[PDB]
Scaffold this active site. Structure first.
Site, mmCIF file in Angstrom:
data_model
loop_
_atom_site.group_PDB
_atom_site.id
_atom_site.type_symbol
_atom_site.label_atom_id
_atom_site.label_comp_id
_atom_site.label_asym_id
_atom_site.label_seq_id
_atom_site.Cartn_x
_atom_site.Cartn_y
_atom_site.Cartn_z
ATOM 1 N N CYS A 77 -4.610 4.472 -1.959
ATOM 2 C CA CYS A 77 -3.580 3.380 -2.033
ATOM 3 C C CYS A 77 -3.213 2.878 -3.471
ATOM 4 O O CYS A 77 -3.664 1.838 -3.904
ATOM 5 C CB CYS A 77 -4.125 2.247 -1.170
ATOM 6 S SG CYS A 77 -3.019 0.842 -0.924
ATOM 7 N N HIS A 111 0.774 -1.300 0.000
ATOM 8 C CA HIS A 111 0.000 0.000 0.000
ATOM 9 C C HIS A 111 0.803 1.348 0.000
ATOM 10 O O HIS A 111 1.514 1.644 0.939
ATOM 11 C CB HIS A 111 -0.938 -0.011 1.238
ATOM 12 C CG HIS A 111 -1.746 -1.305 1.486
ATOM 13 N ND1 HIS A 111 -2.940 -1.595 0.973
ATOM 14 C CD2 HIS A 111 -1.333 -2.348 2.295
ATOM 15 C CE1 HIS A 111 -3.230 -2.780 1.465
ATOM 16 N NE2 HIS A 111 -2.295 -3.200 2.226
ATOM 17 N N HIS A 146 -4.216 -0.578 -5.197
ATOM 18 C CA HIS A 146 -5.526 -1.082 -4.671
ATOM 19 C C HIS A 146 -6.743 -0.176 -4.961
ATOM 20 O O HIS A 146 -7.278 0.497 -4.101
ATOM 21 C CB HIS A 146 -5.314 -1.279 -3.173
ATOM 22 C CG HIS A 146 -4.195 -2.282 -2.889
ATOM 23 N ND1 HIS A 146 -3.534 -2.196 -1.756
ATOM 24 C CD2 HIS A 146 -3.715 -3.351 -3.632
ATOM 25 C CE1 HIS A 146 -2.663 -3.185 -1.788
ATOM 26 N NE2 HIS A 146 -2.778 -3.851 -2.883
ATOM 27 N N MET A 175 -9.628 1.552 -0.874
ATOM 28 C CA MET A 175 -8.447 1.956 -0.026
ATOM 29 C C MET A 175 -8.139 3.485 -0.110
ATOM 30 O O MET A 175 -7.049 3.911 -0.456
ATOM 31 C CB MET A 175 -7.206 1.130 -0.486
ATOM 32 C CG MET A 175 -7.394 -0.375 -0.243
ATOM 33 S SD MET A 175 -5.946 -1.304 0.328
ATOM 34 C CE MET A 175 -6.284 -1.190 2.102
#
Ligand code: CU
Length: 105
Positions: A89, A39, A92, A97
């Site tokens: 992120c 991440h 993602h 996220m």
């Protein structure tokens, strides 16, 4: 104060806990990896108060949160035009996220 925003929640859940954070005019935030890696959090290239890029991605940080228990307590300046910013992120997308910090007082 460096409050922890974990990237995932219990056994599976891949979200932002917490997601909407109103901090102080120049507070500290903590970013901890919880599930499925890696991440990196980039900020509001498009969604920020003074629609800039320059500063946005000078607040957002890329520390590839990949190891199970990686927490990086980081601090902001005291101007950060006291609004609802947005950090996402990188790898993602779809799987929510994304988070927002309000640098207000
Ligand atoms: Cu992620």
């Amino acid at each position: 104060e460096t409050y922890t925003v974990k990237l995932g929640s219990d056994k599976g859940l891949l979200v932002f806990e917490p997601a909407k954070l109103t901090i102080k005019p120049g507070d500290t935030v903590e970013f901890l990896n919880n599930k499925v890696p890696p991440h990196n959090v980039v900020f509001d290239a498009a969604l920020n108060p003074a629609k800039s890029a320059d500063l946005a991605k000078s607040l957002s940080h890329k520390q590839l949160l990949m190891s199970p228990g990686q927490s990086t307590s980081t601090t902001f300046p005291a101007d950060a035009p006291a609004g609802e910013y947005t950090f996402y992120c990188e790898p993602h997308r779809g799987a929510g996220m994304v988070g927002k910090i309000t640098v207000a007082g």
